[PDB]
A paper describes a structure:
The 70-kDa heat shock proteins (Hsp70) are chaperones with central roles in processes that involve polypeptide remodeling events. Hsp70 proteins consist of two major functional domains: an N-terminal nucleotide binding domain (NBD) with ATPase activity, and a C-terminal substrate binding domain (SBD). Hsp70 proteins bind and release client polypeptides in a cycle that is coupled to an ATPase activity. We present the first crystal structures of four human Hsp70 isoforms, those of the NBDs of HSPA1L, HSPA2, HSPA5 and HSPA6.
Author numbering: 6 to 189, 193 to 384
Amino acid sequence: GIAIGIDLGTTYSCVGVFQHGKVEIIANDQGNRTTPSYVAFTDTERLIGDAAKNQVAMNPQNTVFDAKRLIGRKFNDPVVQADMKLWPFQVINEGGKPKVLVSYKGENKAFYPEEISSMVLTKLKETAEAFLGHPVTNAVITVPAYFNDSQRQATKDAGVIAGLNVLRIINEPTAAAIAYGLDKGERHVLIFDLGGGTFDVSILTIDDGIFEVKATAGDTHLGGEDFDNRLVSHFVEEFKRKHKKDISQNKRAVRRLRTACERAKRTLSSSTQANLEIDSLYEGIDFYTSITRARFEELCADLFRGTLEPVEKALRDAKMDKAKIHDIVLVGGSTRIPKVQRLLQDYFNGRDLNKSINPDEAVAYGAAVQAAILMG
Ligand SMILES: Nc1ncnc2c1ncn2[C@@H]1O[C@H](COP(=O)(O)OP(=O)(O)O)[C@@H](O)[C@H]1O
Ligand SMILES: [Mn+2]
């Protein structure tokens, strides 16, 4: 009677199981507790997760990501049409629906967004099966609070394609609240979720175990990727200065620099400096340099400070003052950035923020708790 909880994320996904009184977040084969929502196709194999993201600079047309931006939408949806312009892979109109078109084992192959997502789900499921030592056929899968019926259905369909019985589709902010036991009078909770691609602020009221979404706010195109890109621009300028060379138009160079920037960014959450070392970045030139946390914070200052406007807006929409919020929960990997935590804490006049659960694991953690409840 064992079910898993799955955060099927725009940029990173995560799988947990509640067993013998506690949640285990299941690490992938590289030891990472979260997995990139990436699928890549080569002349010989299909790569999912870390191995797919790792080779993105060498196989841009056939490395698919951001399927969550397509899932449950029609090809003619203006959101899809806008997003298509930003991706290196092809999206085609098949019977009114978007399909990503790739080259795989020497043939053209097209996949629905829910098929791409099913591949990510299948990998997560299989990792859980290896961990537990038996099949897993039940799961709770999470979605953004703003998802419509079509998007929820397509996500549930991804689960069925992956061989799961989907016990429930639950909202991400609700899962995060469940992770912290906030459902166990009225309790008002604010979820601040700054991820890899999206920023969501949710206000929930919880009364006798029942959740009501009181307000949602945010930006569907603000996240960690934007911070990586501020670092990229910075280092593009440093390369123009040290070498009189604009690497800006070499797509591979920019991609490899972005990968290095993401790694450096992560390091800056626990250290005040980070080294970048890119062998042969551009014309056999090694690029060895460094970046301080404080410089990184400056480079992103407008974006970090801008996260407080959706907090204000959500509060206004929920007709609540700051002070009336019982609990604030940090979700999303970008909330590990010290400056983001300071900004939010200062906004809330110094109070404690719920962050003891790794913020990039909290959604899966809550999903895992709820999956076990549903099986009981
Ligand atoms: N220690 C860290 N410091 C800063 N950013 C991080 C850290 N760990 C992960 N990230 C970033 O978190 C983002 C992913 O957030 P996550 O919540 O895991 O996924 P999603 O938003 O797709 O659900 C990525 O931009 C990643 O680089
Ligand atoms: Mn997320």
